[model samples]
Target: KVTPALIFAITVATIGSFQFGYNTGVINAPEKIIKEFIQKTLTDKGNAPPSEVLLTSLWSLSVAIFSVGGMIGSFSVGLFVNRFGRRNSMLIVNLLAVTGGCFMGLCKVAKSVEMLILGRLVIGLFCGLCTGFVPMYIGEISPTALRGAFGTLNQLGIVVGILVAQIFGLEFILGSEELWPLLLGFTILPAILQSAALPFCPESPRFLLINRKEEENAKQILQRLWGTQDVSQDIQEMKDESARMSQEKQVTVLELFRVSSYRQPIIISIVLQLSQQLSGINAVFYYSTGIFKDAPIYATIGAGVVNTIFTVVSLFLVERAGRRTLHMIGLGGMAFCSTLMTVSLLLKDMSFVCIGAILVFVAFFEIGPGPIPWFIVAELFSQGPRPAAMAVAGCSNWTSNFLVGLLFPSAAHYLGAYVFIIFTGFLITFLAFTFFKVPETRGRTFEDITRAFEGQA
Candidate 1:
């Protein structure tokens, strides 16, 4: 039975995704203006302007550094969450994000681009941990029947974040010359939302029962969540798993690679994550300003609106259509449209096709590649190997995003409009991988999922 308490818990936890999405999306529109600030600052300091190459690299580094922080934050997920536990970890990370927001918010006042970069790096760290933490908590807390639907809300929050960021980032709004710092620093509000509200929620009953052996406490929390005293079935389910794990220590990142069953899932997790970024989604987000130069801000908001709407389209379909099916569709759809996107880019007179291609591409992305990768890694592993698994997955996702951030600008520099064609080839490879390699996880329990992988790969 779904209770308000249960809904509240998931909602509060997924606010982290809101922050992550907004952070990711908000950076897009301001890149051009931010570069100008960099140029002006250097000119003011040295009395001679920096070259475009140096300026480009500096801005790239400033943006790419977020992923550097992401890599660091994600790699530490196992230790961080385990040491702090889920709820406390989420609460504690708010400080880092607030600090990051302040750094970026005050960047203009101090006349420093270094603060902006540092804040991006710090906030990247915070967002990386949130990606791993939110899904872990939500997966643990959700009943099996609603798991897929609940999981997809992570992406929902993300799209909404992007949508709001687009709204805020319009030239007449925060994206203007004076308000860009506020744009970068908008991460504070969502962080405070979680920090303020999350304290009322219960910790994972699974963590209490299985890991800590606090059966009474776990049952108490479950009772509160379910809004009923008869939570014996839930407690028993966790109890069985706890007994099964009695002899095994929590798997470290090292043992994760050595275990046979874990090997395939780890790779799948990593590749699925890599596919999401390498499909050129961020390039779309970052480059949309340049794509529709005639009315770029409105174009970006339109794209964000399309992204948010299709996320709900997938939210309904995730449980019914199955993970593997939607992923293939998203990848396959993106592959087709991205080819069109390339054609549109190459032809100037037919530029509206670019907008059409981008909106459709974002739609396809939210359908599968956007949402599945975040939660599927959790489903692929049981609680034992899950944390370490998420660590590696999160790390690879951020690292690839970092590469895209640093290299896409340079790729665009030489390739010009021809650059999206590169993503087309990469999308095809990822599609083939999903077709032959990935497994379907819908309607499967943890034990069933584990058994499905037995003696395979």
Candidate 2:
């Protein structure tokens, strides 16, 4: 079932995911460098330094605005995918990435803080669209048996993207004063890569067959993707789905919410997304950086490495152990880690132990919380409602992530390290609910998936 065309297409589509993580964390490692730039530009303009609160808010706005863009981008998924189809939507989305990259690349040369924020905002929109499209593309392209594997592949692309940014942000690398613009500018590479490479790849077979009603062309693409000449069964499945969804074509987000059959999947997708973000992964990253301010960037890099490694481990296990198993283990482990993390943060050089706690927390997150939410949303819905389901779920993730990013600093400021204590409560709550409520989407094909959800409803 694995073919070069299939593999290559997946690689190209996931370049969107690669940029998703790359741009998201590219600013994080060089946060101080950029903050300093923000301060320097303002001071040079006015002949007086900006106040601490003012600079802090600008920096926070720069960071948090990306999440807002993510929300906007994810919200566009249904409209774009339904109108343009998955691959075309991806091809057009790179325009934003390249423009955003250009703006950030010139921010230093131009000495425009506005350019930097605008760049971040533009790229944030790219990320939202990219995340919404990439997973749906991967899921649509991937065979039933390997969907979980390639779905996690989307997350892997993002992790490596973040890893690359972390490496680039080291002082000896582009994170330095003169070179940081180039660091931020690197997002253009993946955007450009995807646009060039994706044209050679086929439109998603499901997208072409189900949405476009091009059975012969869809079969041709499916044959190429699956490395087989015979695809009658595939065509039949697509036809069945086309009929099943005839009434539900291009599911509106409002219909997605209002339908009883969709209720369980929608609720599960949304809640899982909410739990993943609200578990405080973002807060943990910033908190670790705060405590290890003496040497923050590499610390961030190490956490990235841990996140990537454990995610790789999950790639092997996701199909076998099942998403729910890993997700619960992940949440259970996170709850335990958050509790110990609280103690370490609340206590002595034991604060050093808190670093390990945070890394393990990150490790647990990638194993399930970080990756599964992205992968499972598509699995939960049939092709008809998949884009809208993903849109809503993606919005939930970014919205909650934004909430954490905006609120956590104030939380840390007031509660100090005890901020982790709050996440522990959130983690246990998520664990119990996931154990009971989250459906297992690991084995079933699209038809069976629809049947199971409908049966539940």
Global lDDT of each candidate: 0.85, 0.86
Measured by C-alpha RMSD in angstroms, how accurate is candidate 2?
2.1
TM-score of 2: 0.94
Q: Quick one: RMSD of model 1?
A: 2.5
lDDT tens digits, residue span 261-317, model 1: 788888889999988989988767665666688336676777777888888998899
Pairs that collide, model 2: none
| Residues 211-257, model 2: lDDT tens digits | 88999999999988899977898789889988887866457888987
Instruction: State in Å the error of residue 234, model 2.
Output: 2.0
lDDT of 2: 0.86
What does the lDDT read for residue 8 in candidate 1? Answer: 96
